[PDB]
Amino acid sequence: SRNICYDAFVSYSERDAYWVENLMVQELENFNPPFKLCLHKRDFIPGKWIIDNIIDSIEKSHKTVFVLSENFVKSEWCKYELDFSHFRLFDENNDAAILILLEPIEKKAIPQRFCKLRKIMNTKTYLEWPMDEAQREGFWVNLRAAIKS
């Protein structure tokens, strides 16, 4: 494209909308230099259809960041479990996704048909949003690093 490339496409729920659209934006879009972000629930075109929003964004950005939370799982995760051949090499060996764990998630309650997610939860691979405000700096540092890995 012209220069319509983003550093990351960020899928997330409207319930966690504040954290993403304030906290995360300030640490990245306001960073210096800044990151270019495709905010799932802030930059999607109303007209355009659904899959066209998702797929198109994921393809115009270097990475995909999921902001996992109880809510996100129920309301927005499924679409990401079952996927349809739109990655000649599959999202498995395509740089992979960046998972942020916004809050803990009772996996004892996470379906079971959610293979991918469950893996994530065992692999305990993800940036965990620290409850201790004194440790958030390191978090953002990691996040950026990840988005630029």
Q: Which domains does the chain have, with CATH numbers?
A: 1-149 (3.40.50.10140)
Q: Which two tokens stand for residue 21?
A: 């659209």
Method: X-ray
Residue length of the chain: 149
**Structure tokens given for 117:** 């997610």
The whole-angstrom separation of Cα 58 and Cα 63 is 7
The CB density around residue 103, as the number of other CB atoms within 10 Å, is 15
Paired tokens of 120: 């994530």
CA–CA dist 58, 10 (Å, integer): 9
CA–CA gap between residue 36 and residue 1 (Å, rounded): 15
Calculate Rg over the CA atoms of the chain.
Answer: 15
- What resolution in angstroms, rounded to 1 decimal? 3.0
Can you tell me the distance from the alpha carbon of 2 to that of 128, in angstroms, rounded to the nearest whole number? 35
**CB neighbour list of residue 145: distance below 8 Å, 6 or more residues apart:** none
